[PDB]
Amino acid sequence: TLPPAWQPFLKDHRISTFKNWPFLEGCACTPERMAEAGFIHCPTENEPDLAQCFFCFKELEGWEPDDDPIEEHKKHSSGCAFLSVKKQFEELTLGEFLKLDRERAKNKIAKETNNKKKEFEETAKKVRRAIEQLAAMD
């Protein structure tokens, strides 16, 4: 057992998340390929094919059989450092692993910051709309 917070760096842990993934053999976006590209399966009732990059936390859905997970990851999150990792996990140096883990942590902060901004703006629009109606009154 490696420390639970470091498990997502292991491709086999990532593959294990795809318990009910619908795209299997014959498709480009098989669980092996999705896990290779850095994705974990995060299904919901609303979004059963929802997948998240463990490293940059980009969330993608609406997968089709011909979707190449690497190509999709590159298209939607071109700055994700995981995409530049050419080595296998075991070949990473400790220094490299630690640097990747700090970059992942910065990414998680960035994702939370982004979700907080989005939530606030949803509210600010509704508020702004209401006040716009009042201002429109004599």
């Binding site: 929802l50 980009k58 993608l60 997968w63 089709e64 979707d67």
Partner: peptide
């Protein structure tokens, strides 16, 4: 795929 597309952003959620």
């Amino acid at each position: 795929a597309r952003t959620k």
